[PDB]
Amino acid sequence: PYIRGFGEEPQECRNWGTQIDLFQYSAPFRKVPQSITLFSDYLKALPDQHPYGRGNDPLLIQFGAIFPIGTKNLKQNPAPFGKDTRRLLIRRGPGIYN
Amino acid sequence: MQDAITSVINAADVQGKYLDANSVEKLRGYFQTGELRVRAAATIAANAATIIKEAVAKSLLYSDITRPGGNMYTTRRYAACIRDLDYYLRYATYGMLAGDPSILDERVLNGLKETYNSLGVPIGATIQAIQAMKEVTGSLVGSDAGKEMGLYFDYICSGLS
Amino acid sequence: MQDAITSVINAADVQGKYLDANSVEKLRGYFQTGELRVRAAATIAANAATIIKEAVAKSLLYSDITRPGGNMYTTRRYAACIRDLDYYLRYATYGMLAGDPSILDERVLNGLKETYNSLGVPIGATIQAIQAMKEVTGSLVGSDAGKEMGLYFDYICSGLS
Amino acid sequence: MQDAITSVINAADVQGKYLDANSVEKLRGYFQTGELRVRAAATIAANAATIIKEAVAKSLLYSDITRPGGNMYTTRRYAACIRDLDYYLRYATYGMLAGDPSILDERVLNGLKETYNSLGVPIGATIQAIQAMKEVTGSLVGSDAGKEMGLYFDYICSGLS
Amino acid sequence: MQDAITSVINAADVQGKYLDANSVEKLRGYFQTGELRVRAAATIAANAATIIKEAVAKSLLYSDITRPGGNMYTTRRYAACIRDLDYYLRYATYGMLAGDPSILDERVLNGLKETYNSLGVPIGATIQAIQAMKEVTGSLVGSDAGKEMGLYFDYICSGLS
Amino acid sequence: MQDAITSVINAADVQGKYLDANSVEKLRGYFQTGELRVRAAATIAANAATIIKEAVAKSLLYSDITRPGGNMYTTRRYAACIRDLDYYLRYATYGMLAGDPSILDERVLNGLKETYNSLGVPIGATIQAIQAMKEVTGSLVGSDAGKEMGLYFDYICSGLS
Amino acid sequence: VTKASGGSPVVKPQLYKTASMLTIAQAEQQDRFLELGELNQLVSFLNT
Amino acid sequence: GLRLPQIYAKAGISRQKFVMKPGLSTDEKQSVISACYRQVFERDISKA
Amino acid sequence: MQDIITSVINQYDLSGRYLDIKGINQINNYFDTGLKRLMIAKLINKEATNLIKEASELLFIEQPELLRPCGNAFIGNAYTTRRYAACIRDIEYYLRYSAYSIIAGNNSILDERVLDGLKETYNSLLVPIGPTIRVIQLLKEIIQKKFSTENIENAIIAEPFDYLAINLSDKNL
Amino acid sequence: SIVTKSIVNADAEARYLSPGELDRIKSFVLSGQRRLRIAQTLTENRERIVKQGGQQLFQRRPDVVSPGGNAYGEEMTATCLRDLDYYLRLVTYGIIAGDVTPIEEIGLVGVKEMYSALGTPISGVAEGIRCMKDVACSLLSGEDAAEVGFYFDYTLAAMQ
Amino acid sequence: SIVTKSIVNADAEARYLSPGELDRIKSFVLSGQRRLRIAQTLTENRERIVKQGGQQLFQRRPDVVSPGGNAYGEEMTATCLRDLDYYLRLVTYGIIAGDVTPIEEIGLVGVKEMYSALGTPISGVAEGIRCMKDVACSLLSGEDAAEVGFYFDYTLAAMQ
Amino acid sequence: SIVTKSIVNADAEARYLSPGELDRIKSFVLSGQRRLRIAQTLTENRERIVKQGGQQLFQRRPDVVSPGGNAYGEEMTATCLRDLDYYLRLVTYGIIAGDVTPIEEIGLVGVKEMYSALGTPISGVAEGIRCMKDVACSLLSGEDAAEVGFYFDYTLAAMQ
Amino acid sequence: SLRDLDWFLRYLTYAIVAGDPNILFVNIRGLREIIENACSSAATIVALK
């Protein structure tokens, strides 16, 4: 068996970015599934996360500045967020004061 | 968000063209429907309280979700549910005026299914309350406007499932 | 994966030391309970279908998630969901034998929260099914082994929230 | 946060029940042991700087964790470690007073294992210091309060493990 | 941020060592190139507005990304284009003064590949605009200081690719 | 994945231009040095083992990473260590022969820092092993050849940081 | 509307072969470290 | 199903294949076996 | 993918209800144009090799910059015949997958197999999205010339080629 | 849907729709108003089909309503007939779509796992669907009862 | 668009569109024929408006076309008209949309940072848009020349 | 032979020999007159090489011939020189073939298994090859010893 | 036409300075059938000869 790369066969632009990353020596170090999360994200609405990458919202802790998503974790999840978009924030209190 | 008008302007602007008789036919088709959308949006605004009142009584009023132990039990949570139904009825009116469900993707369904899963809100009963609110509003605005309004009530339901 | 024995060896080897008195007592704590874990592991494997069957009826059987609109409505989603409960029971049994929750990190929990967020599965209802499955198991295996099994049931729930 | 009294009021409210004999038993169980908690909480506040100083020297003072290259080597890192032990001891006293470990989940344990895995803080050595802090405090407060205090030191290490 | 001097101090620091004869070599290498970097950085601040004006002209000025449908087409997208090149040029000279890319990795390259994938910006076209900027500054700064300036331009490319 | 010939052609080809005097000058330096580049790559293949053995002994042999607790302690982590030094020594001659460092970007530096950070490999100690290997190879292949090879050894350390 | 993204990596398609690249890309595919026979082919090309 | 102009794949390095016909030399048998370690294990773990 | 019937049948299953007149009126609107949606697909099948030539020629007459060198930013256009061959291949994907959705009465096949991942692939090869939106809209104008008598066939034809331009487009407003 | 089936079969071969599939789709739209009539007849007679269907089921399998049976009780017998109403709904979906895909994706994939984890005899659900098919075919003409019989038959074969 | 603007204002206050806003939308859609014709008159004279207006700008500002000016040369002078054709295009989008939203979101946000990064005098770009305004008003009647002038005025004002 | 190695890479790509790969064959066959002289001049110096190259091996490793060493006795040393004659023979094959694959498949694949089974220090065998390389290269010019020296050095690497 | 004769000579010099004719093969194989409906094929072989 050989790697059926990009210049070796007609490709499909549905698993484009997933497969190009799978054919790397860094592939065994992504402990999170990359395909089951993307093939189902295509069908569901926009995710609950920062307009930029998922590694841009910090841990809401007492004293912080902790951003876990980095080069040591390897869980980056970009999503196409428009210019005019509003995040569903949850009120720290009674719901009706939102 | 974008309405039907800015959809034509944005599609013709990406190509760089000025305008054409083909996309002008799309604009003229929207103006033909514009007065229908306006009278229906005014009726919904004046009857916003009684649509939610008649939709809650039909769907979820004397059920387990209002008794102790279910979501919607306390007054803190009964008032939150009524407020959510006024979200869907007020944002589905924006999509009915704009003729474009784009606003429901940006400010309504944007991460709404995980928000309910973290709070514990029953997703199945929320769909049944939006469906019940669909026939109630479809009787006020009529069949022509109500059929177009229900196109976005269904959009919220498929985006919430 | 590493059990309670190998966890003691790695702690000493990473320093270059032989096994001293503080590590020898941890090795004795595992040998004294070895016959208690093998006894509970055999009774869980024989009553697995009834632990899952009674944890489901007690938590999420006649709930909203079984009716149309909810998560696990169709038969594939009912069948795919009790296949998840058979993972947690089997891997909580491996952790109880090994006396170390290391295998729950690699083969169960690593990247499991993001999978459920993309699929849309409610985490709050999953934690309630494992907790109901922890109570049924604790009555079959006794009070001593029953609180060992609950030690690795809580590792899945806290590693999932 | 909710204390032991609130947890009993909510468990009856979710059922829609006035406080019966079973819930009145749990209410007296807190009221009887309530003055034993106010004494232990007053003695821990006085020996706070001593309970930490004895668990540090007992556990992680002359290891390679304090030498050059070890996490917590410099004075900034040393002062940051004994500030973490100050919160665990201070929060295990809030939990003992309230009789409910709800305070620990919402303000201590939320995203704490991701915080230490990001910085590189050894989780194994952190659990040892809390275990050492558990017996040094169990000798001051006695045998009754010393067991209930250890109930919330184990809750912290279990969620931190 | 840490420059070349502090990086050599931290290397010996985590071993508990005094600066040996080898560490002073890496320190003497920076001291012999110190006045050359301050002379190169003194000129880039005067031509900073023109280096970005001429680097965009010879790389992507009249290309298909000006034209409708491409990125950086509109004024808001064009104005956001040059705002990124100012961060690459201003931070590439900060790192050249310090002789260490720690301030580029910290503030610029940590989470920039992920923000572009969410925005839809062409990564490849950006890497060629920074490539044109590398040879433009090599005209003012000269060939001697220019290559060190370019060593931090590839660091942006290697980390953005 | 290109040579200097491929780099100069695409530079002129995409401008729709024949190779001019300045463009042929870059190829003249790559052609006339071929007998010198090939002689070095042959003497490197004959001593690929004796270079990695005198680069490890001079850099990281008797240090803390060889001893227990450190990285590269066990036999598997030692064999994986000098297998990486065969990667760098191998791809450095691939670029020295191709005259283009483009092959080091696609198949060496792509994902290099995300792999060592996830494995826990120290990147500072690796640069010292590669810096020593550039010094050992500078005596085998001579001074004129070593200056060329060192341009690719330095190209890895800059992106390996 | 598209709701997800797999990421767009920098990929440059193959354009054409060269006498220098092919002799080197062969050894790279096999980890061979540039066989002596292929080393003599490359030098003969540069001699022209 | 997809489709591609056949010249679009002949441009470039032309990644090579390995077959295991019996009767080859022991080096070609070895190259065919080493190529199967790099593919299944992502790296030749029999010599590392 | 999901045809028009499956979408209406799935929208009713989500409520756990049977199909009433409102859901049967929608299925009748497809069973009315269904015999006309086949005349449109059989025309594409007979004129498929022609309608890609005019769309390619009319595109390059307005965008002469695509048949020229790429510039130092290595944009992927129809510069060489290796690129010209590969880019005419794309024009068949838009025509083929647009004929499917005209018989499905729904754009589910379009986004699931064309749009999901498209801009990530074109932004990876630096292929222009502007001209691609143009040639998609030229195919619509070309195909609509065959159907000029009755205008109910123009609405059916414009739907697949309009969805691709609205979803490949950038939201500037 | 038979339409969706024909578009993905030609999508796999990387070709356009062939004459064998363009004539099959023509046969489906011509049979359109006839399917919407049959599917709306089963939808308007749900009570008579589910009640008569369960009645004859409780005489072929009396052990499910005996003491200890799965459907023993007033609340477990009402849930018994709730499942005969789910499968009558999915059968109308399969008649309108022209194929059995809506039945398979909803209530046939993993149906053995579900009813085995509930304690229900799977052979009793197939015996109830076979008794609804008899009442269902009594409301239709001779040729329409054969058309609907294929969709009831597929459910039985998958439930065994 | 006038509908998109009235919806963001109501959404900013969490309310329904008032009757005063629904009335302004009503007279908006009722005048679609007048403005659809006003926009076509400008779309049909893109050369007479861009070329005549552009020439009057070059002698009212001979610096840009002089040696050392930004648009000194034939190629540079051609890009001078590429911009004057852009803003003329956007002005027709506003007349169709009934709001300055299209003009602002395309070519007014950050316009000063773009022209500064190119080296062109922003004081000269506004001069050309005003000379094009005279040509555009010469082709419209009094009642219609005011509507086209409103969108040109917002562009001249926002460009300073 | 490079001819066979140059065809196996072409057939793996499933194409004719490239114009470059054909140039390697004519240049190799062109140098046939030289390789026949280099390898032949070594053939006439077997006893001077393996004997001198062997005695020097017994001064840098005096334990292999001492009591308890592998080559202790008249027979175990004569068996040691037999292999020095084996490897000098294989080096002349690689010179005429232009490849080390003759030496590889004959005496380098499985060599660590053979000598480990015999109790032979592999480090002592390579020391004799390093001593034969100095005797061999001393009888050839500098231009030839750099070429012949590669085949001696390639076997030392594999023998460690 | 004059644009294409420049490529045949421009791309031809890229080949000799590069290694092999693979650059010419990929861009000339299916070329004569793409354009021969708008230009005589016979007029092209005589040109390149």
Ligand SMILES: CCC1=C(C)/C(=C/C2=NC(=C\c3[nH]c(/C=C4\NC(=O)[C@H](C)[C@H]4CC)c(C)c3CCC(=O)O)/C(CCC(=O)O)=C2C)NC1=O
């Ligand atoms: C603009 C679009 C939009 C929506 C839809 C939205 C929903 C939303 N619903 C919430 C809560 C809630 N939602 C409900 C709703 C329900 N309970 C039931 O039983 C019913 C089935 C259901 C309503 C039909 C309840 C009870 C809460 C309170 C949860 C709690 O406080 O524990 C909260 C948390 C508090 C807050 O308002 O800050 C948000 C954010 N936010 C938004 O921005």
Ligand SMILES: CCC1=C(C)/C(=C/C2=NC(=C\c3[nH]c(/C=C4\NC(=O)[C@H](C)[C@H]4CC)c(C)c3CCC(=O)O)/C(CCC(=O)O)=C2C)NC1=O
């Ligand atoms: C624990 C806090 C709490 C409260 C207070 C509560 C109230 C509550 N009152 C209700 C109805 C009602 N409440 C009343 C009450 C009254 N009619 C009168 O004339 C009097 C002035 C008044 C009583 C003194 C009536 C008539 C209804 C039924 C009206 C309807 O069906 O629309 C309902 C809907 C059905 C139900 O009872 O579940 C709720 C949820 N829920 C809560 O969780």
Ligand SMILES: CCC1=C(C)/C(=C/C2=NC(=C\c3[nH]c(/C=C4\NC(=O)[C@H](C)[C@H]4CC)c(C)c3CCC(=O)O)/C(CCC(=O)O)=C2C)NC1=O
């Ligand atoms: C209220 C809950 C809470 C916690 C617990 C918390 C964790 C926490 N501890 C931190 C650091 C730290 N925490 C420790 C503690 C330890 N390292 C060791 O070697 C030991 C095993 C261990 C003590 C038992 C150390 C050494 C640091 C310094 C890390 C650094 O400077 O990089 C930091 C980084 C910020 C700072 O140090 O000022 C946070 C956020 N913050 C919070 O809000």
Ligand SMILES: CCC1=C(C)/C(=C/C2=NC(=C\c3[nH]c(/C=C4\NC(=O)[C@H](C)[C@H]4CC)c(C)c3CCC(=O)O)/C(CCC(=O)O)=C2C)NC1=O
């Ligand atoms: C949709 C709104 C919009 C505008 C306005 C726009 C302007 C724009 N003007 C440009 C150049 C230019 N623009 C000018 C303009 C002028 N010179 C003069 O003397 C006059 C005062 C002035 C015109 C009235 C010149 C000279 C250049 C070329 C600059 C150079 O070559 O250095 C370029 C760079 C090449 C290109 O991509 O076309 C852009 C993008 N782009 C947009 O998307």
Ligand SMILES: CCC1=C(C)/C(=C/C2=NC(=C\c3[nH]c(/C=C4\NC(=O)[C@H](C)[C@H]4CC)c(C)c3CCC(=O)O)/C(CCC(=O)O)=C2C)NC1=O
């Ligand atoms: C061709 C480009 C390329 C590189 C560079 C590469 C590296 C790479 N290094 C690895 C491991 C490793 N690499 C090291 C390296 C080191 N330890 C030290 O102390 C030194 C500082 C350093 C070497 C100088 C160690 C110890 C491991 C094993 C780590 C572990 O097992 O936990 C692994 C894991 C898989 C395996 O080893 O089979 C890969 C893929 N892969 C590639 O494709």
Ligand SMILES: CCC1=C(C)/C(=C/C2=NC(=C\c3[nH]c(/C=C4\NC(=O)[C@H](C)[C@H]4CC)c(C)c3CCC(=O)O)/C(CCC(=O)O)=C2C)NC1=O
């Ligand atoms: C079924 C949905 C679908 C689409 C659309 C698709 C597109 C697609 N277009 C490609 C390339 C390409 N596409 C073009 C297209 C163009 N150049 C231009 O100037 C024009 C704007 C445009 C023609 C209208 C070019 C030039 C390449 C090759 C780029 C290169 O290699 O440099 C490639 C990479 C080659 C390959 O297929 O292996 C894919 C996958 N794939 C899919 O699965």
Ligand SMILES: CCC1=C(C)/C(=C/C2=NC(=C\c3[nH]c(/C=C4\NC(=O)[C@H](C)[C@H]4CC)c(C)c3CCC(=O)O)/C(CCC(=O)O)=C2C)NC1=O
């Ligand atoms: C260097 C390798 C190479 C070549 C040569 C090449 C040619 C090429 N010639 C083309 C068209 C054309 N080529 C020609 C004419 C001719 N062509 C000739 O070689 C003759 C001198 C002449 C006929 C006598 C004409 C008339 C067209 C336009 C055909 C059309 O309208 O489609 C096109 C389509 C786009 C265009 O230019 O209009 C390409 C890609 N591509 C390549 O990658």
Ligand SMILES: CCC1=C(C)/C(=C/C2=NC(=C\c3[nH]c(/C=C4\NC(=O)[C@H](C)[C@H]4CC)c(C)c3CCC(=O)O)/C(CCC(=O)O)=C2C)NC1=O
């Ligand atoms: C749309 C596809 C689909 C099906 C079919 C389905 C079935 C289903 N059947 C159930 C129970 C049940 N089903 C039966 C059924 C039967 N008892 C008998 O004797 C007969 C043989 C048989 C019916 C003919 C009984 C008795 C229960 C209750 C079991 C219990 O409560 O322990 C339950 C649990 C509670 C509930 O109704 O929500 C589900 C989810 N769910 C689905 O989504």
